[PDB]
CSV table of C-alpha atoms and ligand atoms in Angstrom, one decimal:
chain,number,residue,atom,x,y,z
A,1,UNK,CA,-21.6,15.8,0.9
A,2,UNK,CA,-19.6,17.0,3.8
A,3,UNK,CA,-15.9,16.2,3.6
A,4,UNK,CA,-15.4,18.2,6.8
A,5,UNK,CA,-13.7,16.3,9.6
A,6,UNK,CA,-10.5,14.9,11.0
A,7,UNK,CA,-9.4,11.9,9.0
A,8,UNK,CA,-6.9,9.2,10.0
A,9,UNK,CA,-5.3,6.9,7.4
A,10,UNK,CA,-6.2,3.2,7.6
A,11,UNK,CA,-4.8,1.9,4.3
A,12,UNK,CA,-2.3,3.0,1.7
A,13,UNK,CA,-1.8,1.1,-1.6
A,14,UNK,CA,0.7,1.6,-4.4
A,15,UNK,CA,2.3,4.7,-2.9
A,16,UNK,CA,5.9,3.4,-3.4
A,17,UNK,CA,5.2,2.8,-7.0
A,18,UNK,CA,3.8,6.3,-7.4
A,19,UNK,CA,7.0,7.8,-6.0
A,20,UNK,CA,9.0,5.6,-8.4
A,21,UNK,CA,7.3,7.1,-11.4
A,22,UNK,CA,8.1,10.4,-9.9
A,23,UNK,CA,11.8,9.6,-9.7
A,24,UNK,CA,12.3,9.2,-6.0
A,25,UNK,CA,15.1,6.8,-5.2
A,26,UNK,CA,14.4,3.7,-3.2
A,27,UNK,CA,15.8,4.5,0.3
A,28,UNK,CA,13.8,7.7,0.3
A,29,UNK,CA,10.7,5.9,-1.1
A,30,UNK,CA,10.8,3.4,1.8
A,31,UNK,CA,11.1,6.3,4.3
A,32,UNK,CA,8.2,8.1,2.6
A,33,UNK,CA,6.0,5.0,2.7
A,34,UNK,CA,6.7,4.8,6.5
A,35,UNK,CA,5.8,8.5,6.9
A,36,UNK,CA,2.5,7.9,5.0
A,37,UNK,CA,1.4,5.4,7.6
A,38,UNK,CA,1.2,8.1,10.3
A,39,UNK,CA,-0.6,10.7,8.2
A,40,UNK,CA,-3.7,12.7,8.8
A,41,UNK,CA,-6.0,14.9,6.8
A,42,UNK,CA,-8.2,17.7,8.4
A,43,UNK,CA,-10.9,19.1,6.1
A,44,UNK,CA,-13.2,22.1,6.5
A,45,UNK,CA,-15.7,22.4,3.7
A,46,UNK,CA,-18.2,25.3,3.3
A,47,UNK,CA,-20.2,24.8,0.1
A,48,UNK,CA,-17.7,24.7,-2.7
A,49,UNK,CA,-14.7,26.0,-0.7
A,50,UNK,CA,-12.3,23.6,0.9
A,51,UNK,CA,-9.6,24.0,3.5
A,52,UNK,CA,-7.4,21.0,3.7
A,53,UNK,CA,-4.5,20.4,6.2
A,54,UNK,CA,-2.3,17.3,5.4
A,55,UNK,CA,0.2,16.4,8.1
A,56,UNK,CA,2.7,13.7,9.0
A,57,UNK,CA,4.8,13.5,12.2
A,58,UNK,CA,7.2,16.2,11.2
A,59,UNK,CA,5.5,18.1,8.3
A,60,UNK,CA,2.2,19.9,7.7
A,61,UNK,CA,0.9,21.7,4.7
A,62,UNK,CA,-2.4,23.4,3.8
A,63,UNK,CA,-4.3,23.3,0.5
A,64,UNK,CA,-7.2,25.8,0.0
A,65,UNK,CA,-9.3,25.9,-3.1
A,66,UNK,CA,-12.7,26.5,-4.5
A,67,UNK,CA,-14.2,24.0,-6.9
A,68,UNK,CA,-13.8,25.3,-10.5
A,69,UNK,CA,-11.2,28.0,-9.6
A,70,UNK,CA,-7.6,27.4,-10.5
A,71,UNK,CA,-5.0,27.5,-7.7
A,72,UNK,CA,-1.4,26.7,-7.1
A,73,UNK,CA,-0.1,23.8,-5.0
A,74,UNK,CA,2.6,21.2,-5.4
A,75,UNK,CA,2.8,17.7,-6.8
A,76,UNK,CA,3.3,14.7,-4.6
A,77,UNK,CA,7.1,15.0,-5.2
A,78,UNK,CA,7.1,18.7,-4.3
A,79,UNK,CA,7.0,20.3,-7.8
A,80,UNK,CA,4.9,23.5,-8.0
A,81,UNK,CA,1.8,23.0,-10.2
A,82,UNK,CA,-1.4,24.7,-11.3
A,83,UNK,CA,-4.5,22.8,-10.2
A,84,UNK,CA,-8.2,22.8,-10.9
A,85,UNK,CA,-10.8,20.8,-9.0
A,86,UNK,CA,-14.2,19.7,-10.5
A,87,UNK,CA,-16.9,17.5,-9.2
A,88,UNK,CA,-17.5,14.1,-10.8
A,89,UNK,CA,-20.6,13.3,-8.7
A,90,UNK,CA,-22.2,14.2,-5.4
A,91,UNK,CA,-19.3,13.0,-3.2
A,92,UNK,CA,-16.3,12.8,-5.6
A,93,UNK,CA,-14.0,15.5,-6.8
A,94,UNK,CA,-11.2,15.3,-9.3
A,95,UNK,CA,-8.1,17.6,-9.6
A,96,UNK,CA,-6.0,18.0,-12.7
A,97,UNK,CA,-2.5,19.4,-12.2
A,98,UNK,CA,-0.2,21.2,-14.7
A,99,UNK,CA,3.5,21.7,-14.0
A,100,UNK,CA,4.5,25.3,-13.6
A,101,UNK,CA,8.0,24.6,-14.8
A,102,UNK,CA,9.7,21.9,-16.8
A,103,UNK,CA,8.1,18.6,-17.8
A,104,UNK,CA,7.2,15.5,-15.9
A,105,UNK,CA,4.6,12.7,-15.6
A,106,UNK,CA,0.9,13.6,-15.8
A,107,UNK,CA,-0.4,13.9,-12.2
A,108,UNK,CA,-3.9,14.2,-10.6
A,109,UNK,CA,-5.7,13.4,-7.4
A,110,UNK,CA,-9.2,12.5,-6.4
A,111,UNK,CA,-11.2,12.7,-3.1
A,112,UNK,CA,-14.4,10.7,-2.5
A,113,UNK,CA,-16.7,10.1,0.4
A,114,UNK,CA,-18.0,6.6,0.4
A,115,UNK,CA,-21.5,5.7,1.7
A,116,UNK,CA,-19.7,3.8,4.6
A,117,UNK,CA,-18.1,6.8,6.2
A,118,UNK,CA,-14.7,6.5,4.5
A,119,UNK,CA,-12.7,9.1,2.6
A,120,UNK,CA,-10.9,7.6,-0.3
A,121,UNK,CA,-8.1,9.7,-1.9
A,122,UNK,CA,-6.3,8.6,-5.0
A,123,UNK,CA,-3.2,10.1,-6.6
A,124,UNK,CA,-2.1,9.4,-10.1
A,125,UNK,CA,1.2,9.7,-12.0
A,126,UNK,CA,0.8,8.5,-15.6
A,127,UNK,CA,-0.3,4.9,-15.4
A,128,UNK,CA,0.1,4.4,-11.6
A,129,UNK,CA,-2.7,5.0,-9.2
A,130,UNK,CA,-2.1,5.2,-5.4
A,131,UNK,CA,-5.2,4.7,-3.2
A,132,UNK,CA,-5.4,5.9,0.4
A,133,UNK,CA,-8.3,5.2,2.7
A,134,UNK,CA,-9.2,7.3,5.8
A,135,UNK,CA,-11.8,7.1,8.6
A,136,UNK,CA,-12.9,9.9,10.9
A,137,UNK,CA,-10.8,10.3,14.0
B,201,RET,C1,-6.9,16.4,-1.1
B,201,RET,C2,-5.7,15.8,-0.6
B,201,RET,C3,-4.4,16.0,-1.1
B,201,RET,C4,-4.1,17.0,-2.2
B,201,RET,C5,-3.3,15.3,-0.5
B,201,RET,C6,-2.0,15.5,-0.7
B,201,RET,C7,-1.1,14.6,0.0
B,201,RET,C8,0.3,14.7,-0.1
B,201,RET,C9,1.0,15.7,-0.9
B,201,RET,C10,1.0,13.7,0.6
B,201,RET,C11,2.3,13.6,0.7
B,201,RET,C12,3.1,12.6,1.4
B,201,RET,C13,4.4,12.5,1.2
B,201,RET,C14,5.1,13.2,0.0
B,201,RET,C15,5.3,11.5,1.9
B,201,RET,C16,4.6,10.6,2.8
B,201,RET,C17,3.5,11.2,3.5
B,201,RET,C18,2.5,11.9,2.7
B,201,RET,C19,1.4,10.9,2.2
B,201,RET,C20,1.8,13.0,3.5
C-alpha cells in the first residue's frame, strides 16, 4: 500500500448526520457540509509512519502517527482524544478514539485504498457512518 499523495474529495455522504450525533446545531452543520466539499488530504507514508495534512479553504491541520502507537488528536467536532491506528488488511487502517475529558459518543475513523485508485475515509459516531471518497490530484 502507498497512501502517499495529494487527495481531492469527490464524494461526501452522511456528514451532516455525523455532526448531528456530535451535537452541532443545524446552521453550523450546513456551513460545515459546504466546507467539506472543498477539502483536501495530503498524505506522506513511510512504512508504518504517516503524516497527514487535512485542509479546507480557511483551516489546515496535521495528524502524525505510527501504526500501533497511541497518539493525541481531536474528534471531528474538535474534542481532544487519544487515538490508536491498526491495520485491518493490506490497504485499510482503523483508528479507535477515546475522549481525554468528559463523555460523548463513540468515535472512530478508517482509511482505505481501493484497487481503483480511490482513497475512502469513513468517520463514525455511534451508529452513524460518514463516508468520504477522494481521488489523487
Ligand atoms: C485520516 C484522516 C482523518 C483523521 C481526517 C480527519 C478529518 C476531519 C477532522 C475533518 C473535518 C472537517 C470539518 C470538521 C468540517 C468540514 C470540513 C472537514 C471535513 C475538513
